[PDB]
Ligand binder design. Structure first.
Ligand SMILES: [Ca+2]
Lengths: 49, 41, 53
């Protein structure tokens, strides 16, 4: 649910597969500078702790 | 005993990797790695 | 050896990238704070910049 407990689930500790929804969304760079700004909900594992 | 081929034993069965010798860090308890003989400084 | 930790770092260089609030008006600076990491247990953090130390 992107913010609760399972926003990053990996089948083992070194799996190449990785399921992760985090509500990532890209925003427009502004006023003539080069950067990539994004927006996502904070960590669900951190919120669980 | 002795440690593996990728580990350098300092003393008292405590070994460090090969790149971890003479690297300005006394990682070992006996500090045998930076001794004037192994390091020469 | 101390040289073993710098074999792949001799091939890299510093760079100038933008960062907000040098002084007042969002400079382009040799120091550019990217990816501050603060998940330790005594307030010790690791800061990645653009300069080479
Ligand atoms: Ca050492």
């Amino acid at each position: 649910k992107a913010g609760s407990f399972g926003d990053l689930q990996s089948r083992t500790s070194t799996s190449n597969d990785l399921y992760a929804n985090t509500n990532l969304k890209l925003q427009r760079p502004q006023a003539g500078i080069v950067h990539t700004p994004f927006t996502q909900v904070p960590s669900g594992f951190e919120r669980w702790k | 005993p002795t440690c593996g081929a990728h580990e350098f034993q300092c003393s008292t069965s405590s070994c460090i990797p090969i790149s971890w010798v003479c690297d300005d860090d006394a990682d070992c308890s006996d500090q045998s790695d930076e001794s004037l003989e192994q390091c020469g400084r | 050896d101390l040289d073993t930790h710098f074999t792949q770092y001799k091939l890299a260089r510093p760079y100038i990238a933008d960062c907000p609030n040098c002084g007042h008006s969002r400079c382009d600076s040799p120091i550019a704070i990217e990816e501050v990491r603060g998940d330790a247990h005594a307030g010790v953090i690791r800061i990645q910049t653009s300069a080479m130390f």
